[PDB]
């Protein structure tokens, strides 16, 4: 019977498809590892797929995956137990060390580029002629932390040019320098910008950028990680 053949065939196709899908999804983070960074004995029944190569635009190179995985950074953590499967305690200050919910990946220390090869993200003052088109303009507002203390003041919005959206608020601290706060981590209110993740005294600790009119993939990760990390690590000063 033809319908029997079709259904039997479809199930074979589907098993092959799942196989293809599962192996495609192993192009990052494999091979599996023990807690010490060495190859685990049990890799499971799916083998790594043949490598593929992405040609990156603007002479940024290629990416080939799967390939040799390494963190390319020290991880300030240590075992809390004598066997596998337990948590690893921060050895220093997890906010400063960039671990746990404060983690960052070692992405390329260059800015994301748009389709024309220009910096994707720019402060608004340097983006012609971008401006606030709706909603409360946060520029000028005091920035309050989860301790209800003023940490600083908004001096600009960093915008995504090709996608015409707000990505960071640039915030000036008591000392005259600035930090970026991810847009997703702030509440813009009528009289303030409220930051639930950080108490005021942790604002100085926000990773700084090296050029004041661009931000690198690497710097983005450190900022976003640091600010997210505050949810867990600032919790003693909140109390909300």
């Amino acid at each position: 019977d033809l319908a029997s053949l079709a259904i039997y065939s479809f199930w074979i196709f589907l098993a092959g498809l799942i196989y293809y899908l599962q192996t495609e999804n192993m192009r990052e983070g494999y091979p599996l590892e023990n807690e010490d960074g060495t190859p685990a004995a049990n890799q499971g029944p799916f083998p790594l797929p043949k490598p593929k190569t992405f040609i990156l635009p603007h002479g940024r190179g290629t990416l080939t995956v799967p390939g040799p995985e390494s963190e390319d950074r020290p991880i300030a953590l240590a075992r809390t137990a004598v066997s596998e499967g337990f948590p690893h305690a921060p050895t220093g200050d997890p906010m400063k060390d960039g671990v746990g919910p404060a983690s960052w990946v070692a992405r390329r220390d260059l800015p994301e580029l748009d389709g024309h090869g220009h910096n994707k993200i720019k402060p608004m003052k340097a983006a012609a002629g971008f401006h606030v088109s709706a909603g409360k303009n946060p520029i000028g507002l005091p920035v309050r932390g989860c301790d209800l203390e003023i940490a600083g003041k908004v001096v600009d919005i960093w915008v995504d040019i090709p996608e015409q959206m707000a990505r960071f608020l640039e915030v000036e601290l008591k000392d005259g320098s600035t930090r970026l706060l991810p847009m997703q981590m702030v509440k813009v209110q009528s009289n303030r910008v409220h930051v639930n993740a950080l108490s005021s005294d942790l604002f100085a600790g926000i990773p700084t950028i090296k050029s004041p009119t661009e931000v690198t993939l690497l710097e983005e990760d450190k900022i976003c990680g640091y600010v997210a990390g505050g949810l867990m690590y600032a919790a003693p000063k909140r109390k909300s």
């Binding site: 319908a3 899908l21 990052e28 088109s133 709706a134 981590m185 509440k187 993939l217």
Partner: protein
């Protein structure tokens, strides 16, 4: 509370974005439309530009011809009365020829011929719109994934109105043009074929339809949960994995013991979706051609 990133708090605008050029014939692009502040709380504010070109115009005109052929019939059925038209809008139906005419184009206008003309215009509207999804990708140097995915939807459509009727021996097997009547056709199709719940392809089709809602709830939710680390910048996370993509992965690894990559989730996505109409088209195509009664088939599984 925490801001959830469902609606934006602050919109920004800059010069109208006219987009990438690559091999696109710029002569065929409109200029920007208006900007919608409303749309921009949720997505992009900018409307247009759109691309015209010869296939575009063909498809569009042909699509309207389809729509107006049905609309003309509707007015006729309403006796040209504006108030009856609205009252009975969902009850109007443009029906295919009766079985007697088989596959011939010899049926009178008021008894099938108009359905055929409507169907003709639909055929060229859709297929030329397909050529469009291919060509707009080509002109940009992009992969052909959209046109390949569109083809799975086209398969079910083609099966319902064209392939199945041809294999069955008559246009009377096809779907009528009307709101309520397309529903009655659907119910009747199942009844007459022994209940589609016994068609293994209908069951798969459902698994994938539900699967799509599960998966898009999962993916959408995940991206929003990691948008605080720039997670929605999926292409650069593919090219250079960030903490967004690592936290996303690990969320799922810790929850259910396996995970995706930033590129691979989108392959799970496309296949979950296209499998809906793929299995669907097969289930419908076998109905009445090979299997009269799914219940009966199910009792033998063959």
């Amino acid at each position: 509370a925490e801001y959830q990133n469902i609606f934006s708090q602050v919109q920004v605008r800059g010069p109208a974005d006219l987009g990438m050029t690559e091999d696109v014939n710029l002569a065929n692009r409109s200029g920007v439309g208006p900007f919608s502040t409303l749309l921009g709380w949720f997505g992009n504010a900018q409307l247009g530009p759109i691309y015209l070109g010869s296939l575009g115009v063909l498809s569009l005109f042909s699509g309207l011809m389809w729509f107006f052929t049905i609309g003309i019939w509707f007015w006729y059925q309403a006796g040209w009365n504006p108030a009856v038209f609205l009252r009975d809008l969902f009850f109007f139906s443009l029906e295919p020829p009766a079985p007697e005419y088989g596959l011939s184009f010899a049926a009178p206008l008021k008894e099938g011929g108009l359905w055929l003309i409507a169907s003709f215009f639909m055929f060229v509207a859709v297929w030329s719109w397909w050529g469009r999804t291919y060509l707009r990708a080509q002109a940009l140097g992009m992969g052909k994934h959209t046109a390949w995915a569109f083809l799975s939807a086209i398969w079910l459509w083609m099966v319902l109105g064209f392939i199945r009727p041809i294999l069955m021996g008559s246009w009377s097997e096809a779907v009528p043009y009307g709101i309520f009547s397309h529903l009655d056709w659907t119910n009747n199709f199942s009844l007459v074929h022994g209940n589609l719940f016994y068609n293994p392809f209908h069951g798969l089709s459902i698994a994938f339809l539900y699967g799509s809602a599960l998966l898009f709830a999962m993916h959408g939710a995940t991206i929003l949960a990691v948008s605080r680390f720039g997670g929605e910048r999926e292409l650069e996370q593919i090219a250079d994995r960030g903490t967004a993509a690592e936290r996303a992965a690990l969320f799922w690894r810790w929850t259910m013991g396996f995970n995706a990559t930033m590129e691979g989730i989108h392959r799970w996505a496309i296949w979950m979706a296209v499998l809906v109409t793929l299995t669907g088209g097969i289930g419908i195509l076998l109905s009445g051609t090979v299997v009269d009664n799914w219940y009966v088939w199910g009792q033998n599984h063959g």
